[model samples]
Target: GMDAKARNCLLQHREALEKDIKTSYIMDHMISDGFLTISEEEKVRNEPTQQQRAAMLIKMILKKDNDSYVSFYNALLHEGYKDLAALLHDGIP
Candidate 1:
């Protein structure tokens, strides 16, 4: 159930990101921050595949959580994602 739920949520999130990329100015922010960049047709030959992109996204999310567990929880609670924040904070006990 956990795996299924996580997979479903991740799919939803990825779809949202794809929509944003297609319709929003957030791609500009990503490029400006060096998280992504445009490439010419020739350069696009070296671009990562969708699966690779998915893996990279998952790794980035996990790495952020691993590296900043405390700050992540702090921000979560601070922003009032309280139930989710409490899940992480109470995980130790």
Candidate 2:
């Protein structure tokens, strides 16, 4: 189980995390720099946790890097969210 502070911290980051996802990968370089048509972005924005993954070749075009996201996972580690931390870590790395 997580401590109170850790749980609160995880919940707090959820909102910003969405925005991060947009600028980090979903936003395309074309059309004023954005990805996914308006509808696709809408789907991702709406679904929140149901995203699919891309292959290594996809990143060549997608540029879907996760360096910034690692910090959030690390923060989870520090705040005593080891379980959640592992979830993010395994996914990202």
Candidate 3:
């Protein structure tokens, strides 16, 4: 069915996008802010379970719980993405 086709297509890169939001978000921020290195950042790329990464993102970025919003929602703040970051503000409170 068309639904399954679309699902599979999106699933193909779900892990990539997940890593980008969960782990890379913090690493990219630290790198840009001169707190980390590229090689160092590479080491933690999805090295942990998806839950762990999301937990870390929630703690570091939102400094809050992973109750409702997804990691991608809060990740924009780490990369200084004004528009996307705004999404989190609305989502949170």
Top lDDT: which candidate number? 3
When summed lDDT is taken over every stretch of 10 residues in candidate 2, the lowest stretch is 52-61
- List TM-scores for all candidates, in order: 0.32, 0.30, 0.32
Ranking by TM-score: 1, 3, 2
Taking the tens digit of each residue's C-alpha lDDT, what string does model 1 give over 1-93? 123333334344444333222211322333344543364222332335644343444333333323233443344455555655455554321
Q: Which digits, one per residue and each the tens of the lDDT, describe model 3 over residues 12-76?
A: 43344444454665556555655445655555554577555644444333332232233333345
Kindly list the per-residue Cα lDDT of model 2 for residues 4-70, writing each as its tens digit: 4433443454443433333323233221233235654444445434222212112222233343244
Worst lDDT 10-window in candidate 1:
18-27
Scored by CA lDDT, what does every candidate get?
A: 0.38, 0.38, 0.45
- Show model 1 residue runs off by greater than 4 Å: 1-58, 64-67
Which pairs of residues collide in model 3? none
Off by over 4 Å in 3: 1-22, 34-47, 62-84, 90-93
lDDT of 3: 0.45
Clashing pairs in 2: 27-34, 27-35, 28-33, 28-34, 28-35
